[PDB]
Design an enzyme around this catalytic site. Structure first.
Site, short mmCIF file in Angstrom:
data_model
loop_
_atom_site.label_atom_id
_atom_site.label_comp_id
_atom_site.label_asym_id
_atom_site.label_seq_id
_atom_site.Cartn_x
_atom_site.Cartn_y
_atom_site.Cartn_z
N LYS A 95 0.81 -1.21 0.00
CA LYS A 95 0.00 0.00 0.00
C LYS A 95 0.85 1.27 0.00
CE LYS A 95 -2.23 0.88 3.69
NZ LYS A 95 -1.81 2.25 4.07
N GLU A 113 -2.75 7.58 14.07
CA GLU A 113 -1.58 6.92 13.51
C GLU A 113 -0.66 6.44 14.62
OE1 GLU A 113 -1.30 6.01 10.56
OE2 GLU A 113 0.67 6.34 9.64
N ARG A 114 -0.20 5.19 14.50
CA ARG A 114 0.86 4.71 15.37
C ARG A 114 2.15 5.47 15.06
NH1 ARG A 114 -1.97 0.01 13.23
NH2 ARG A 114 -2.81 -1.28 14.92
#
Ligand SMILES: [Mg+2]
Ligand SMILES: [Mg+2]
Ligand SMILES: [Mg+2]
Lengths: 464, 57, 385, 240, 193, 121
Positions: free
Chosen positions: A164, A190-191
Site C-alpha cells: 500500500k 496513527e501509530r
C-alpha cells in the site's frame, strides 16, 4: 478586558467564564499560557476549542492536549478566529500536527507567513464544474478497470503486507511528474512507529519534496484526532484555489475520524444514536467530504483507507462513508504471492466511471471483454487442477492478460534496477485489444512481466 | 457390475458437492440475520443504560 | 516487609511519550524461549504485543517463562499484577525467587481487595519506573497482568463521579486511557541513548468473544496479538497458542538470519496441515499428498509442544526446527518426537559443540553438509521404540 | 364509534357489528403523546400505561344481557415482529385470531393466513361437530410434520427420505395450495369472478384430499379455486 | 446565481390534506417511458408509488428518465434532492438542461453539508410549491430523492432535544413525519377543479 | 458466616471448611439496593461497585501462617449464560470445579463426580 477564567475541569473538557457580551464565537481557539509563580504550581501551554454556549457567560470547550495542572481562575486568551494553519510552498517537505506547528525539528515557520482557518463552508453550487473528467494516473490496471475521476472519492481496501505504501508513493510521483500536482497526507489515529517508517520511506524514494504531512497520533485527546483531516484539507485547498492545480489528498483511516467524533460526543453528554454512534454522524461526514470537489479552477482528489468493523458492511459508519465514494480498489495477498505488482484485484475493484458515455465505446468494450475472460479463467481452476475446445484458448489468452496487468514503478527502481514507466490510457487499451485479438499469441508468458507498453514485451521476447 | 460401481461412486461425489453448496448458502443468510441481531442488541442496551442514568436528574 | 526503600528520585506518573523524530526502527529480537512464539510470532525490542485469551489458558506461565529467560540478556523486567489474588501473586514471586530472577525484576501489585483508584493507577506507576532505566540506555520489559480489570476500575470511578456514560457504561475517554499508556513504549534513536521498552499487555475474554468493547479497543493499538485457545489447553497442549489468528506486524525484522531461513517452511507446513486436521477419521484419501501432509503436520505439532519453565536457547530451537523441516523426522514415529528432541539436545551438548558456537557468534546457521552429517550421526545412536 | 354502537346495544337490544380499520394506531398515537406529557418511557420506548389504556378500550366491547357487539379488528405488526409490546398485549383480548405472514404471500398463496398460529375458542368437538374436529386436527398435524422437514430438504434434498415422509410431503403441498381461494373483491386484480364455499363442502373436500383420492393430479391445479369439483375441472382443462 | 426570483404569493409549509369528499378514483395514466414499468407496474395521475432498492441500483436514472419523458404531456415536474452530493446535483441539472426539460421543472436542493433543520423541511417546501399548481386544475409530479435521509436528519434533530428514542433510535412520530407528507398527493374531484 | 469461621483459624489454628449455598445471590442483592442509594447503573443493570464487593468478600478466606479456610461454593448461572457479569466476575477467584452428573448416578457410581469435566489448577 477580553480575558476569561477557568471554572471547571473534567478531564479533556473545560469551562471558561467571560465578561458580559464578550463571549467567543463557536469553533474559536483559546490559549492558556501560565508560568509557575511558586513551588506549588506547574507551567501550562494549552489550546482549547469552543463547543457550546451554556448561558450565564459560560462557554464549554474541549482540549487539544493534556489538562493536568490546571487551576480554577487562570487567565484565558481569546484569539478571535478558529485554528489557523500556515499554507503555501513553505509546507512542502515538512511534518505538522493539528495546530500547524512543525514536529520534524527543522526550525519554525516565520511569524509573518499567511495562515488559514480550519473551519470553512463548502464551495457554492455555482462554482462547481458542470462536466465529468478522468484523472490519468498512469497505472495500467487502475486506468483500465477502475478509472479515477477528478474531484472524486476512492476507497482503498488494502492492509499490511500487500504493498500500500508503495502504491501511494507511485501515485504521488506520477501525478507530480506528469500533471504538476501536489500531494497531502493526513494520518488520523496513527501509530508513531508506522509514521516514522512512512516518513523514512518517503525520504528514501525522494517524493518528500512534493508532499505535505500531518499527523494526529493515537496518544492524543479525542478532540485532536477529530480535527486533523481538516488541517490537511485546508492545506490542499490553498493549492486548489490560489494556483489552480489538481491536488491529491490521502487519508490514512477515515474510521478513526468517526470514532474520535463519537468519543467527543460522549464526553459532551449527548444521547447516543443507533449502535451507539453520535447523533450527528452524517452531518460531520458530509461537512468533511463536501469540501473535496472539482471547481472551475482545479480539483482535489481523495484516496481514503477504510476499515470495516466486525466485517459488517451494513454498520452505520461504513454505510455512511460508502455513500460518498466514487470508486474502490482492493489489494489481495495471493496476487502478491505470484509476483504481480501492484496486487490489485481485477474483479473486486469497481468504479462508476466505467460507463460508455464517459470513457467512450472502445475502452468500455475492451474492459468488459477482459473481465469476462478473467472470470472464465477463474471458473476453470477446479477443472484444471484437454477439458474442452475453446477453454484451452481461453486459458492461453488469460495467462497473458493477467500477467500484462503488472508494471514497473519508478519507486521500485532503487530496489530492482529497471527505470519504471508511465503508460497512457490509449496505449494500454490498444495493447489489451491486440492481446484479446491474439496478435501476440506466439510469445512466452514470462515476457509479459513488469513492462510498460506493448512494445517492451516484444523486445523482451526477442532478447530472451 | 464394474460399470455399476463406477457409476455409484460418481453419483455419490456429485450429490456431496451439491449438499456442500447448499450448506454454504444457508450459512450466508444466517450470518446476515446474525449481524442484524447484533446491532439491535447493542442499540437496546445503550438506550437502557442512558435512560436509567437520566432518571436521577 | 523487608524495610524501607532508599531512593533519591521521583518521576511524575503522567508524562508525555517520545516524539516521532525521537525513534528508530525495531531490529533487535526479544527471545522468549517458547518455540511457537519465537518461530511464528516474533517479538522485537520496542514492540507492543498483546496476549489475549480466556481464563484457564495459562498466560501468566507465558509471561513468567519470558521473564525467566532474560537471565543473561541484559534486561530489566517489571511485572504488574492488577486485580489478582494475593495468594497467586505470592506464589508467583516465590517462583521468581527460586530461579534467581529477582536480581533484575520489580513487582507492582494491586490485588482485588484494594480501592479502585489503586488498580487504575498501577500500570502508570510500572511504566514510570521503567522509563527511568529506558532514558539511560538500558532495555526494559513491562508486563500488565490484566488491562480489563484496570478498565473496570476506571469505569467504576467515573460512574461514581457522575460522568456521562457510553457503550457498556464506559466513559468517553476509555480509548485515550489505554492508548496514552501503550504509546510510551518505544525504541529510541542513537541521539537519545538507544534504550527501549517492550510491553506485553493481557486481555481476558469470556467464551472466546473478541467483539467486545475493550478487546477491540486494545487490538487496534498494539503491533499484533497472540491467541490462546481453551480447547487446546484442556487436551494438554502447552502452550495453547493458535497460529491461525496470531499476527506480528514487525515480522522478520525481529529475527536472526538462521530463524528467518528456517521458519518459512514450518509456517507453510502448519498452514497446510491445519486445513485437513479435522478429517483424519476418514482415511483412504489421495495417497499422493494427503496422508503425507497429515504426517508432516503431526510431526510439526509435536515439535511445538513444551513444558512449564525450562526455556530453550535459540540455537537449539533453530537446529531442531531445521531437522524437522528437512525431512529428518519421518522415520521416527509420532509418539517418540518429544524424546527424540530431548535426546538430540543432550547429544548436541557433547559432540555438537561447534555448530552451536558458530550460530551464537555469527548468527547464521552452519554449513549444510556438516549439519546433515551431524544429524545422520545422531540418528544411528537413537534407539526407536 | 364505540359510543355509537353502545347506544344501539344498550337502548334497543339489537345485534351490532363493529369494524375497526387498524387498532394499532390507537396505541401508537398514545405513545407519541405520552413522551410530551412527561412520562418515563417503558420498553422499546412505549408508554408506561399501554396495557391499562388497551384494557379500558377493549372491555367496553362485550355482549351483555340486552344485546351483543361482534367486533372484527385489523391489527398491524411493526417490522414483522410478533413479539412487539403492542401485538403481544392485544393478543389477550381475542376469541379468534388470524395471522398473516409475508412468506406465504410471497409464494402467491392468498389469503396468507398461517394455518398453525391461528386459533379459535369455538374449535371444540361439541360446538362444530366431530367430523370437523378430526379433519382439522389431521390437516394441522400433516402441515406441522411437513414444516419439520424443511431444513433437511433444503440441504440434502428429497432423495434421502423414507416413503412415509415423501407421502407426507406429497399431501402437504396439495393441502397448502388448496387452502387458497379467489375473492370477489380481488376480481379487478386477477379476473376470476370469486368464490363462496359452505362449511360442509370444505370438510368434504379436505377429507377427500386426506384420503389420497386426488393424489395423481398436478399440484398446480389446486391454486385459487373454490371447491374440489373446480379442482377436477381445472386439472381436466390442463390436459390430465 | 441567475438573480432574484420575482414571485408574489406564499403558501404555508404545514397545511391540511384534501378530505374524503374531495377526491375521486384515479383514471388517467402517467407514462414513464420505461417498458417494464409501463407494462408491469403502471402508475396513474394522483397515485403514490414507492421506488425501493439498495445503493448503486440507479434510481436517480429512473427519476430523470421519467421527468424527461413528460415533454409533450401537460405536466409540471418538481425534483427534490435531500442529502445528496452537490456535484451530482450539478450534473443532473446539466443533464436536464440538455434535453430541454427545464421549461417545466423546479429543483429544490439541500446537500449533505447543510444543517439537519434544512434537510428536514425540503419535502414540505416541494409539496407546498406543487400544491399551488395542483389547486388551479393543473397536474404535478414530485420526486423525493431520499426519505431515508430526511428520517436520519429528523432523528438527529430530535435526539439533540432529548426525546426518548424507540426502535433503531428513531423517535415515536417518525411514522407521522412521513404519513402527513405523502397524504397531500391526491386526485381532486371535479367540484374542486 | 465468614466472621464465625475466622475465629477458629486465628485463635485455635485449625483448618476450616466454609460452604456457601449460592454466591450469585449475594451480588444480586447488592444491585437491588444500588439504584435506591442514588448510583448510576453499569452494564446489564448491575451496580458500579461489583468487583470491589466480590473481592472484599473473597479475599478474607486464605491460608495464613496459623491455619486456613477453604470454601466450597455453589454457583447458579442465569439461563446458562457464562458471560453474565456476575458469573464472569466470580469465576476469576476459583481454583477448581467439581461437576456432578446424573448419568453416573443412574448407573450406580457414588459420588457422581464427572471425571472428564472436573478441572483443577
Ligand atoms: Mg490465565
Ligand atoms: Mg389495515
Ligand atoms: Mg438516491
Amino acid at each position: 478586558m477580553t480575558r476569561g477564567r477557568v471554572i471547571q475541569v473534567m478531564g479533556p473538557v473545560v469551562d471558561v467564564k467571560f465578561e458580559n457580551g464578550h463571549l467567543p464565537a463557536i469553533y474559536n481557539a483559546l490559549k492558556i499560557q501560565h508560568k509557575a509563580r511558586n513551588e506549588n504550581e506547574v507551567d501550562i501551554d494549552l489550546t482549547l476549542e469552543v463547543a457550546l454556549h451554556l448561558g450565564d457567560d459560560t462557554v464549554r470547550t474541549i482540549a487539544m492536549a493534556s489538562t493536568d495542572g490546571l487551576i480554577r481562575g487562570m487567565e484565558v486568551i481569546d484569539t478571535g478566529a478558529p485554528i489557523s494553519v500556515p499554507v503555501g510552498e513553505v509546507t512542502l517537505g515538512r511534518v505538522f500536527n493539528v495546530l500547524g506547528e512543525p514536529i520534524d525539528l527543522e526550525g519554525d515557520i516565520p511569524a509573518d507567513a499567511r495562515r488559514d482557518p480550519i473551519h470553512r463552508p463548502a464551495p457554492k453550487f455555482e462554482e462547481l464544474a458542470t462536466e465529468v473528467e478522468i484523472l490519468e494516473t498512469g497505472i495500467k490496471v487502475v486506468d483500465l478497470l477502475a478509472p479515477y475521476i477528478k474531484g472524486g472519492k476512492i476507497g482503498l481496501f488494502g492492509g499490511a503486507g500487500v504493498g500500500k505504501t508503495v502504491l501511494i508513493q507511485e501515485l504521488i510521483h506520477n501525478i507530480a511528474q506528469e500533471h504538476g500536482g501536489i500531494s497531502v497526507f493526513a494520518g488520523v489515529g496513527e501509530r508513531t512507529r508506522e509514521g516514522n517508517d512512512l516518513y523514512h520511506e518517503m525520504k528514501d524514494s525522494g517524493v518528500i519534496s512534493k508532499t505535505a504531512m500531518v499527523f494526529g497520533q493515537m496518544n492524543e485527546p479525542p478532540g485532536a484526532r477529530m480535527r486533523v483531516a481538516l488541517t490537511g484539507l485546508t492545506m490542499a485547498e490553498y493549492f486548489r484555489d490560489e494556483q489552480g492545480q489538481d491536488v491529491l489528498l490521502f487519508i490514512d483511516n477515515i474510521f478513526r475520524f468517526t470514532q474520535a467524533g463519537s468519543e467527543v460526543s460522549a464526553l459532551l453528554g449527548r444521547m447516543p444514536s443507533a449502535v451507539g454512534y453520535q447523533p450527528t454522524l452524517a452531518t460531520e461526514m458530509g461537512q468533511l467530504q463536501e469540501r473535496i470537489t472539482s471547481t472551475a479552477k482545479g480539483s482535489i482528489t481523495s484516496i481514503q483507507a477504510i476499515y470495516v468493523p466486525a466485517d459488517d458492511y451494513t454498520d452505520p459508519a461504513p454505510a455512511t462513508t460508502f455513500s460518498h465514494l466514487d470508486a474502490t480498489t482492493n489489494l489481495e495477498r495471493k496476487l502478491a504471492e505470484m509476483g504481480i505488482y501492484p496486487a490489485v484485484d481485477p474483479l473486486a475493484s469497481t468504479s462508476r466511471a466505467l460507463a460508455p458515455e464517459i470513457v467512450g465505446e472502445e475502452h468500455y468494450q475492451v474492459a468488459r471483454k477482459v473481465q469476462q475472460t478473467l472470470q472464465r479463467y477463474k471458473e476453470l481452476q477446479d477443472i484444471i487442477a484437454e477439458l474442452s475446445d475453446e477453454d484451452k484458448l481461453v486459458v492461453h489468452r488469460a495467462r497473458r492478460i493477467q500477467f500484462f496487468l503488472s508494471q514497473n514503478f519508478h519507486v521500485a527502481e532503487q530496489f530492482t534496477g529497471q527505470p519504471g514507466s508511465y503508460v497512457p490510457v490509449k496505449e494500454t487499451v490498444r495493447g489489451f485489444k491486440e492481446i484479446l485479438e491474439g496478435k501476440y499469441d506466439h510469445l512466452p508468458e514470462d515476457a509479459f512481466r513488469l513492462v510498460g507498453r506493448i512494445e517492451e514485451v516484444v523486445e523482451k521476447a526477442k532478447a530472451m | 457390475l464394474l460399470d455399476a460401481k463406477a457409476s455409484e461412486h460418481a453419483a455419490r461425489m456429485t450429490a456431496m458437492k451439491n449438499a456442500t453448496d447448499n450448506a454454504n448458502e444457508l450459512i450466508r443468510t444466517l450470518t446476515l440475520s446474525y449481524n442484524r441481531a447484533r446491532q439491535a442488541a447493542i442499540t437496546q442496551e445503550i438506550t437502557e443504560i442512558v435512560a436509567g442514568a437520566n432518571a436521577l436528574q | 516487609g523487608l524495610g524501607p526503600v532508599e531512593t533519591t528520585e521521583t518521576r511524575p506518573i503522567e508524562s508525555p511519550a517520545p516524539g516521532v523524530m525521537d525513534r528508530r526502527s525495531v531490529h533487535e529480537p526479544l527471545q522468549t524461549g517458547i518455540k511457537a512464539i519465537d518461530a511464528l510470532v516474533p517479538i522485537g525490542r520496542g514492540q507492543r504485543e498483546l496476549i489475549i485469551g480466556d481464563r484457564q489458558t495459562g498466560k501468566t506461565s507465558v509471561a513468567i517463562d519470558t521473564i525467566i529467560n532474560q537471565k543473561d540478556q541484559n534486561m530489566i523486567s517489571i511485572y504488574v499484577a492488577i486485580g489478582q489474588k494475593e495468594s497467586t501473586v505470592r506464589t508467583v514471586v516465590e517462583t521468581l525467587r527460586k530461579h534467581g530472577a529477582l536480581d533484575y525484576t520489580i513487582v507492582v501489585t494491586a490485588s482485588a481487595s484494594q480501592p479502585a483508584p489503586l488498580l487504575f493507577l498501577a500500570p502508570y506507576a510500572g511504566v514510570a519506573m521503567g522509563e527511568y532505566f529506558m532514558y539511560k540506555g538500558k532495555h526494559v520489559l513491562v508486563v500488565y497482568d490484566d488491562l480489563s480489570k484496570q478498565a473496570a476500575a476506571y469505569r467504576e470511578l467515573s460512574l461514581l463521579l457522575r460522568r456521562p456514560p457510553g457503550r457498556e457504561a464506559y466513559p468517553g475517554d476509555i480509548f485515550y486511557l489505554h492508548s496514552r499508556l501503550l504509546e510510551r513504549a518505544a525504541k529510541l534513536s542513537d541521539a537519545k541513548g538507544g534504550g527501549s521498552l517492550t510491553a506485553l499487555p493481557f486481555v481476558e475474554t469470556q467464551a472466546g468473544d473478541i467483539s467486545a468493547y475493550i478487546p477491540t479497543n486494545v487490538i487496534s493499538i498494539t503491533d499484533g496479538q497472540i491467541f490462546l485457545q481453551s480447547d487446546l489447553f484442556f487436551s494438554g497442549v502447552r502452550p495453547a497458542i493458535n497460529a491461525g489468528l496470531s499476527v506480528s506486524r514487525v515480522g522478520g525484522a525481529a529475527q536472526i538470519k538462521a530463524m528467518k531461513k528456517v521458519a518459512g517452511t514450518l509456517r507453510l507446513d502448519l498452514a497446510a496441515y491445519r486445513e485437513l486436521e479435522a478429517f483424519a477419521q476418514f482415511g483412504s484419501d489421495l495417497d499422493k499428498a494427503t496422508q503425507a501432509k497429515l504426517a508432516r503436520g503431526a510431526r510439526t505439532v509435536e515439535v511445538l509442544k513444551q513444558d512449564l519453565h525450562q526455556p530453550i536457547p535459540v540455537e537449539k530451537q533453530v537446529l531442531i526446527i531445521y531437522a524437522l523441516t528437512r525431512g529428518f523426522l519421518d522415520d521416527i514415529p509420532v509418539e517418540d518426537v518429544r524424546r527424540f528432541e530431548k535426546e538430540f539436545y543432550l547429544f548436541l551438548d557433547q559432540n555438537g559443540q561447534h555448530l552451536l558456537e558458530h550460530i551464537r557468534t555469527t548468527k547464521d546457521l552452519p554449513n549444510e553438509d556438516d549439519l546433515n552429517k551431524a544429524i545422520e550421526a545422531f540418528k544411528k545412536t537413537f534407539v526407536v521404540s | 364509534g364505540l359510543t355509537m354502537a353502545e347506544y344501539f346495544r344498550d337502548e334497543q337490544g339489537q345485534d351490532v357489528l363493529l369494524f375497526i380499520d387498524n387498532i394499532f394506531r390507537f396505541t401508537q398515537a398514545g405513545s407519541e403523546v405520552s413522551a410530551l406529557l412527561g412520562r418515563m418511557p417503558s420498553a422499546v420506548g412505549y408508554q408506561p400505561t399501554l396495557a391499562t389504556e388497551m384494557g379500558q378500550l377493549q372491555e367496553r366491547i362485550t355482549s351483555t344481557a340486552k344485546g351483543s357487539i361482534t367486533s372484527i379488528q385489523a391489527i398491524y405488526v411493526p417490522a414483522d415482529d410478533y413479539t412487539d409490546p403492542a401485538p403481544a398485549t392485544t393478543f389477550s383480548h381475542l376469541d379468534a385470531t388470524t395471522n398473516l405472514e409475508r412468506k406465504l404471500a410471497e409464494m402467491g398463496i392468498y389469503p396468507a393466513v398461517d394455518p398453525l398460529a391461528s386459533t379459535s375458542r369455538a374449535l371444540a368437538p361439541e360446538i362444530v361437530g366431530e367430523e370437523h374436529y378430526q379433519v382439522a386436527r389431521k390437516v394441522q398435524q400433516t402441515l406441522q410434520r411437513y414444516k419439520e422437514l424443511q431444513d433437511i430438504i433444503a440441504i440434502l434434498g428429497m432423495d434421502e427420505l423414507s416413503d412415509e415422509d415423501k407421502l407426507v410431503v406429497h399431501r402437504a403441498r396439495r393441502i397448502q395450495f388448496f387452502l387458497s381461494q379467489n375473492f370477489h373483491v380481488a376480481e379487478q386484480f386477477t379476473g376470476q369472478p370469486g368464490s363462496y364455499v359452505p362449511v360442509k363442502e370444505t370438510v368434504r373436500g379436505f377429507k377427500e384430499i386426506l384420503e389420497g383420492k386426488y393424489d395423481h393430479l398436478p399440484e398446480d391445479a389446486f391454486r385459487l379455486v373454490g371447491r374440489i369439483e373446480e379442482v377436477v375441472e381445472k386439472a381436466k382443462a390442463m390436459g390430465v
